[PDB]
Each structure stands twice: as C-alpha cells, then as structure tokens.
Design a protein around this ligand. Structure first.
Ligand SMILES: *[C@@H](CC(=O)OC)C(=O)N[C@@H]1CC[C@@]2(O)[C@H]3Cc4ccc(O)c5c4[C@@]2(CCN3CC2CC2)[C@H]1O5
Ligand SMILES: *[C@@H](CC(=O)OC)C(=O)N[C@@H]1CC[C@@]2(O)[C@H]3Cc4ccc(O)c5c4[C@@]2(CCN3CC2CC2)[C@H]1O5
Ligand SMILES: CC(C)CCC[C@@H](C)[C@H]1CC[C@H]2[C@@H]3CC=C4C[C@@H](O)CC[C@]4(C)[C@H]3CC[C@]12C
Ligand SMILES: CC(C)CCC[C@@H](C)[C@H]1CC[C@H]2[C@@H]3CC=C4C[C@@H](O)CC[C@]4(C)[C@H]3CC[C@]12C
Ligand SMILES: CCCCCCCC/C=C\CCCCCCCCOC(=O)[C@H](O)CO
Ligand SMILES: CCCCCCCC/C=C\CCCCCCCCOC(=O)[C@H](O)CO
Ligand SMILES: CCCCCCCC/C=C\CCCCCCCCOC(=O)[C@H](O)CO
Ligand SMILES: CCCCCCCC/C=C\CCCCCCCCOC(=O)[C@H](O)CO
Ligand SMILES: [Cl-]
Ligand SMILES: [Cl-]
Lengths: 442, 442
C-alpha cells in the first residue's frame, strides 16, 4: 500500500499548497480594484474550480486508506459533481481566455468595447451553466454502492451499464478535451494570421479607424461605415444606405463584406494621395518627407480632407525644412488636436520621430499572452495522459500489473497536481500577481 | 442505393480532380528548380500521399456497387496499406511543416543552416519509415474474407478480434490524431511566444549575431559563443573554455544556458554604451541621434570596438550634422563594409533612414505561414469527424437508421475529399504555384 501512502503524501502537498494558493488568488482578485481585469476574472474562475477539487482531495485519500466510503451519499454526489465541474469549467475557461487573448490582440478597437470585466463575469456564468448540463445529471446519478464487504462512491447506471458509462466517457472526451483544444488551436492560428507589426500607412490607418461592417455614427456624429469612410451629413439612414449602395453597386441594406471594406479603403487612400498631388501647398511638402512622415500626412488628408490640411502653412513650413519639434509643438496647438487629441498625438509623434513608436503595442499584451499560453501548456501536460488513459481502458483490456495501477494513479495524481501548479505560475508570469504576493509576504 | 451512387459521383469528382491536381503539383515541384524549396518538398510528400489515396478510390466505388471485392488479395492489401499510409504521412507532413515554419520564423540564423531542401527530403523519408511501422503490418494482416454470399477486403485478426481491432484504433488515434495535433499546437504557441517585431537594439543585434550555445569559430575565425561575445584570438579550445569559465564562474565545458547568454549579452551592450561615453569623439555624436540611429552606433561599437569606431571622423561628422545620405555613402566605402557587407548594409540603412526597415522580415514568410496554416485547418475540418466517429463506434452501439450510415459515409467521403481540396488551395495561397498553374494553362 506504499502507493496509497505516497498518494496520501503527494495529495497532502497538493491539497495544502493548492488550497492556500487558490484562496490567495481569489482573495487578491476580489480585494483590489487594480486586480479587476478580464484576464483576472477568468483566472478567478480557474482558481475557484481548482479550490473546489482540492477541497474534495482529503476525502479521497482516506477512501484510499480505509477501503470504504464513510462520508455518506450526499457528500459523495457533491464530490463527483465537483470533479466533473472542475474538469469542464477549467478547460472552458482556458478556451474563453484564448479567445479573449485573440480578441485583445487582433481586434483592439473592437476589444475596447466588450472586454469589460462584466462580460468576463457573464461568460464565466455561461461556462458554469454549460458545465451544469453535464454536472447536474452526474450529481443525480451519483450514489453509494454497497459491495460484499466494502462501500463505493462510484457513478452507477442501469443496464446496460457499459453503454451509459462509455457514452458519458464519449461526451466528456469530445466536449472537455477534443473540441476545446481545437478551439484553442484555431485561436492561436488565427492569432499568428492576424498579428503583424505596423510599418505602413494601411495598417496605421486601420489602427486609427477600425473595421466596423455596419453603418455607425462616428465621433463627429455622421453616418459612417468600413474603415473611416464617410457617407453623408444627413441623419436619415436611407440617404446613408443609398450612398452605400451607390459606393458599392449592389443593394447593401447597410452591411458590406471585408473585401468590400478593404476595396473601399484602398481607393480612399489613393484619393488622398491624389488630392495632395493636386495641391500646390501640400505637394511640395510631400516630396520632402521620409515614408513614415509621408504616411502621417496622408493620415491627416484622410481625416479632415485636402482643404483643411492646406491651411497648416507654418506646420507645413517647419515640416518641409525638417523642423520636427517645432512642427510637433505647433501642430499640438491646432483645433484638430482639440477635437481628436489621441489620434492627433499619434500622428504628431509620427511627424516628430519618423518612427512608428506611437502605434506599436504595449508589452502588457505580450506578457499576459505569454502567461495564458504557458498556463494552457501546463494544463495540457497535466490532463492529456488521463484523458487518453480513460478512453484506452474503456475499449481494451490491460494486463494487470503493479505498473498499470502505478501509472494510472500517477496520471490521476498529476491531473490533480495541476490545481496546485496554477497559482505558482501566476506569480512568475504576472508582475501584479507577484507584487500582490510580496504585499502579502513582506 | 442512392447513397452508393451519389458516393460514386462525388468520388468521381474527387478522383478526377484529385489525381489531376496532385499529379500536376508533384510534376511542377520536380520540373522547376525555382520550385525546389523545403516547403515545396513537404508539399510534394503531401501531394504524393493524396495521389495514392485517390488512386485507390475507383476500386472502392465498384465495391460499393457490386457488394463484393473482385480485385483479389494482393491489390486489397495494397489498398488498405495505402489508406493507412495516407492517414499517417499526411498529418506527419503537416507536423514537419508546422515545425519548419516555426524554425524559419523564430530562428532565422539557425534556419539558414538546416532548412536546405535535402533535409526536408530526409525528414520525409523518416516520415515514411515511421508510417511504415504501422503500414507494413496492416499490409500483412490485410486479406480477403469470404462470407455467406459476398467477399470482403477487411483487415482481420485472430481471437480475440475486438482486442486487436480496438488496439489498432487506439494506436492510430494517438499517433495519427492526438499527438500530431498537440505538436502543431505547441509549434503555434511557441511561435506567437517567440515572434515579435524589431524596435530595439537587443532584438536588432540578435538578428545580426544569433543564439549559438556552443563555442564556435566566427567569421573572423575566432572562438566565439553566445550572442557575438568574443573570447580569445588563440586557436586552442582550453584558452577559450577557460575564458568562458572565467566569464561565467562555473565550469562550462564549452556550453552555457540561454539565461547565461542573455546575461552575457546585456553586459556587453552596456559596456559598449559605456565605452562610447568615455570617448570624446563618439560621445558628442551619440547625443545628436534619435534612438534608432543610436542603436546603429552601439551595433558598430559592439562589433569592432570603441577604438575602431573612433576613426570614422568624416562619417561621424556627417552623422552629427545629420547628413544622412552623405554619411551612408561614406560608410559604404569603409573596410568594415568590405569585410562584413550584409551586416554593414543593415546598419548603414539604419543610419540613413532612422527606421528599422533593413531588419523587418520579408512578406514571403507571412504568405507561406498563412498557406500552411490554412491547409492544416482544412485538414482538421476534413479528418476530425471520422477520427471521432470511429472511436465512438468502437465503444458504444448506435441505433441503426439511414441517418447513421449517411453521416458515416459522409464523414469517410469528406475525409477523402481533403485530397482533392489540397491542390486547389496551393493555387490560391501561393503565387509561384498559381504562376505555374497559369504557365500550364495559358
Ligand atoms: C471510468 C472507468 C473507471 O475505471 O472508473 C473508475 C473512468 O475511468 N472514469 C474517469 C476516472 C477518472 C476521473 O475520475 C477523473 C479523470 C477523468 C478523465 C476523463 C474522464 O472521462 C473521466 C475522468 C474521471 C472524471 C474526472 N476526474 C477528473 C480529476 C482530474 C482527476 C472519470 O471520468
Ligand atoms: C473499424 C470499425 C469499422 O466499422 O470498420 C469498417 C473502423 O472504423 N476502421 C476505420 C474505418 C475508416 C478508415 O478506413 C479510414 C478512416 C479512419 C479513421 C480512423 C481510423 O482509426 C480508422 C480509419 C480507417 C482507416 C483509415 N481510413 C482513412 C481514409 C480517410 C478515409 C479505419 O481505421
Ligand atoms: C504528455 C502527453 C502528451 C503524453 C500522453 C500520455 C499517454 C499517451 C501515455 C502516458 C502513460 C501511458 C500509459 C502508461 C500505462 C499503460 C499500461 C500498459 O499496460 C498499457 C499502456 C498504458 C495504458 C499507457 C498508454 C499510453 C499512456 C497513457
Ligand atoms: C468539424 C469537427 C470539429 C466536428 C466534429 C464532428 C463530430 C464531433 C460529429 C459530427 C457528426 C457526428 C455524428 C453524426 C452521426 C451520429 C449517429 C448518431 O446516431 C449518434 C451520433 C453520431 C455518431 C454523431 C457523433 C458526433 C459527430 C461524429
Ligand atoms: C486548508 C484547509 C485544510 C485542508 C487539509 C487537508 C488535509 O489533507 C490530507 O492530509 C490528505 O493526506 C491529502 O489527500
Ligand atoms: C458553484 C460555483 C458557481 C460559479 C458561478 C459563476 C461565478 C464565477 C463568475 C465570476 C467570478 C466573479 C469575480 C468577482 C466579481 C464578483 C464578486 C465581486 O463583486 C464586485 O466587485 C462587482 O462589482 C459586483 O458584484
Ligand atoms: C486520372 C486516372 C483515371 C482515374 C479514373 C477513376 C474513375 O473513378 C470513378 O469513376 C469512380 O466513380 C470514383 O470512385
Ligand atoms: C511509396 C512512397 C515512398 C516515399 C518515400 C519518400 C519519398 C518522398 C521524399 C521526398 C520527396 C522527393 C522530392 C523530389 C526530390 C527527389 C526527386 C528529384 O531529384 C532531385 O532533383 C535531387 O536533386 C536528386 O534526387
Ligand atoms: Cl509592435
Ligand atoms: Cl517585421
């Protein structure tokens, strides 16, 4: 029974540090207002699940040693239910984390709208409901099975037993393993696919304008669609939809496609460059610029039009003579800046530096992405052997040796060990987290 | 038997366009010297497999219609063997493609060494050997099974039959589905993790120097290790290993760790900046520069040392006065340029532009990565339903309805349809490929 006792020891470490760590994490998330972010809401869900599983650990270890389940019927139902709930909610939360990461990175303008932590709370609730769809019947079908001279807290079914058992094994195998992993993989691939640094004007302006496929009132309150493409001053939707129909050639109903937006984009960019070329105030300043600053100029022409950018005589003067800090200061004193300060700040920085540093993303995204990725990898390493082992046993017979039981309980074990591994990871891969940890320690 | 006839029609389309397409692809790869790249070698392997499966298609359709296998014993063995070989070699090739992509992107300096197409050919061979480990016994255990009034080309086993059958199902399920998908996922995650554009000096210099963890003779023929960190002029390894031991503090034996290289890196970068600061010729030119050009200066000090970069009076003059094209031209006429032209070209471009455009990667990488990613996604969409369906049937009983057989043969069908889907994809996601296609068409 050395296996049983080593299981007890290992499980004691996992239980103590697991509970301690997850309680610490949840408490920290709840307590500080700085710690309340979408990522941290998801992390909270994860920590909750882990805390529950670890809570059920000590009852299992004494089951190992006694050879019986003393704790009754209801507590058993609770235990198994918590087991399944953990298995589901964990990987589902990892999924929502991968999706949220993908959104935060590949769709920043859209990200700022719905990446509020309340949405993370909502999707966490939905996670728990979907998981309730499997967890509740498991809680119902769990009971105490009496045997010759022992007691079991197994999940039992009516005849044919192997049927319902293996059916459950299928459902968990598809929904709690295959599908979520596939979703994560798609998120990652799509992420590599849609992530690329900004070195040109087209990328630059999309950061400034965004991809909105429906007609929306802009900052100035005018009906707009695509990437910053303006339609009409009038408030009526038809005069905007008919202009959209005119710009496209087919009846839009107020909705276009990505290719139609990209096509609408390129013509506006060239129309801006064209407009510059026919302007005797702009065209000279145009050729005096490096590509980065030339892009900044097109950005202004894109926004307010050629006639408006024409009346920037002194800023244009300073630009043509290459007086950068002078021009930047003068540009910051315009009504343009007063209207759209953040965008103007980026463009002015582009004029001043000749570098793209006003656009390139913060390192926070990279750090959090790294964190989530590593967490996911650890989870996969911990849960893959058991998910596979179960399916294997379900459909073939294994030559009973001590090695079989050792490997089996080892897989179950590490499957539980993930739960105590998690908070330790939060410390290393997150600076605010290790900061909170230090605040609790020092 | 409408199912059988529609299967025949569908399979005729898949067979004709599949064979045509894959033969076309393979021929194009073989014929042109421009088409011989690592990516295209992998693609060749894929096309080969697909061509084989499609080759086995027509024999199956007549099996559907006749209700018997007329084609004998050997041809049957061939068919099933080809089936399994396709299933394995395809996804293995996708794996090697994801790995090669990851290498090409995240380790360019290392990439240029072993991304020769001969290595792709070698790994293709190994792919076929690993796949031979499962394909050969399948070819042996395949035979003609006679029944009441029909004939089967099934794979049959001795008693217990379900045991060996389900065992095979397990092995294919782990090795031809789970594990490869996991490997791909790890490649993608690691890719996002190690991919980031260049905006600072540390990234810049790593591009120029590379991460080599063993002591190697550099371009100048001196013993070097880490990121461009020099050791000794002497040819003896000990005097280099002892210097490495001295630089680290523990006995290295000529091998360090990534953290030790990164630490060795930061001190050299600052030592360069320090050296500049104590130089009355360099320090003035230092403060006159924007961050990008300041990085270029550190790059030179890193390479040839403070004393060498001191004797660039005229280039330094032109730099301080901000005469960029002048300085760039003058720098290109140095013995520095004559020695290491490619690196010097990048640094000079950095001095001339103030932008990082000499470092940012080619769009070819992005395009090919996109291609491979999309191919992989399509494959997953095509092979997932059947891989799952098989496991399901292996361990539970399905209520026999027409819907069951329809869905089943539909899954098998699309599983075969991937093979004809592939070459069409090569046309869209690759410009050289659609160019070859046009050369064959127009
Ligand atoms: C059925 C056959 C059997 O031997 O039951 C004793 C079976 O293996 N059910 C598993 C046992 C392991 C399990 O309690 C674990 C691991 C896991 C993975 C997959 C899956 O289908 C099943 C399981 C569980 C339920 C979930 N817990 C999760 C904790 C990490 C260990 C049963 O269902
Ligand atoms: C065993 C039970 C059965 O009903 O045999 C008739 C079984 O399902 N074996 C599968 C049938 C399908 C199969 O011929 C296909 C698909 C596939 C996927 C998984 C896997 O384990 C097995 C298979 C094959 C062998 C591979 N081909 C690949 C072609 C794309 C269709 C058998 O083994
Ligand atoms: C790190 C991850 C990806 C690896 C996946 C682990 C899986 C594939 C490995 C790890 C441990 C392995 C099991 C260890 C013990 C046994 C008992 C033996 O009599 C039959 C094989 C069997 C059932 C193995 C099946 C495959 C197995 C479950
Ligand atoms: C696109 C990919 C990721 C989706 C995965 C497809 C899988 C999960 C789906 C697609 C078709 C589905 C099968 C369709 C037909 C049947 C017969 C039915 O009596 C039992 C369910 C069963 C066996 C389904 C099992 C699940 C199934 C195999
Ligand atoms: C913190 C709450 C106390 C948990 C103790 C479990 C104690 O659990 C144990 O000691 C078992 O050996 C673990 O399975
Ligand atoms: C059996 C388990 C069932 C789990 C069901 C889902 C619960 C988990 C969902 C979201 C986690 C909550 C994070 C903290 C915000 C709410 C508490 C702190 O409150 C706040 O600060 C808000 O502003 C107002 O509530
Ligand atoms: C090209 C080679 C000829 C292949 C014909 C298969 C012809 O195959 C067929 O016609 C069957 O219907 C497909 O299963
Ligand atoms: C039953 C299938 C067994 C498959 C075994 C592995 C074969 C596939 C491996 C590599 C693909 C070859 C690509 C073309 C290069 C060799 C032919 C063209 O030759 C060349 O041009 C070379 O320079 C010299 O050979
Ligand atoms: Cl960036
Ligand atoms: Cl780049």
């Amino acid at each position: 029974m050395v296996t049983a006792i080593t299981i007890m020891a290992l499980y004691s470490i996992v239980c103590v540090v697991g509970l301690f760590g997850n309680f610490l994490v949840m408490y920290v998330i709840v307590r500080y207002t700085k710690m309340k972010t979408a990522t941290n809401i998801y992390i909270f869900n994860l920590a909750l699940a882990d805390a529950l599983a670890t809570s059920t650990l000590p009852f299992q270890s004494v089951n190992y040693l006694m050879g019986t389940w003393p704790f009754g019927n209801i507590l058993c139902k609770i235990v198994i239910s918590i087991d399944y709930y953990n298995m589901f909610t964990s990987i589902f939360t990892l999924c929502t984390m991968s999706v949220d990461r993908y959104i935060a990175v590949c769709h920043p303008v859209k990200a700022l709208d719905f990446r509020t932590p309340r949405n993370a709370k909502i999707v966490n609730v939905c996670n728990w409901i979907l998981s309730s769809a499997i967890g509740l019947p498991v809680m119902f079908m769990a009971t105490t099975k009496y045997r010759q001279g022992s007691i079991d807290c197994t999940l039992t079914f009516s005849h044919p037993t192997w049927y319902w058992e293996n059916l459950l094994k299928i459902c968990v195998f598809i929904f709690a393993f295959i599908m979520p992993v596939l979703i994560i993989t798609v998120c990652y691939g799509l992420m590599i696919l849609r992530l690329k640094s900004v070195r040109n004007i087209f990328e630059m302006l999309r950061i400034d304008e965004g991809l909105r496929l429906k007609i929306y009132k802009n900052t100035e309150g005018y009906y707009t669609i695509g990437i910053g493409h303006l339609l009409t001053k009038s408030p009526s939707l038809n005069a905007a939809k008919s202009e959209l129909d005119k710009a496209i050639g087919r009846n839009t109903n107020g909705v276009i496609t990505k290719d139609e937006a990209e096509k609408l984009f390129n013509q506006d960019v060239d129309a801006a460059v064209r407009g510059i070329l026919r302007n005797a105030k702009l065209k000279p300043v145009y050729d005096s610029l490096d590509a980065v600053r030339r892009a900044a100029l097109i950005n202004m022409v894109f926004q307010m039009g050629e006639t408006g950018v024409a009346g920037f005589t002194n800023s244009l003067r300073m630009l043509q003579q290459k007086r950068w800090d002078e021009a930047a200061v003068n540009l910051a004193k315009s009504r343009w800046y007063n209207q759209t300060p953040n965008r103007a700040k980026r463009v002015i920085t582009t004029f001043r530096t000749g570098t793209w540093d006003a656009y390139e993303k913060d390192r926070n995204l990279r750090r959090i992405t790294r964190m989530v990725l590593v967490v996911v990898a650890v989870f996969i390493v911990c849960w893959t052997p058991i998910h596979i082992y179960v399916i294997i046993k379900a459909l073939i017979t294994i030559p009973e040796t001590t090695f079989q039981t050792v490997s089996w309980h080892f897989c179950i074990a590490l499957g539980y060990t993930n739960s105590c591994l998690n908070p330790v990871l939060y410390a290393f891969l997150d600076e605010n987290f290790k900061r909170c940890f230090r605040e609790f320690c020092i």
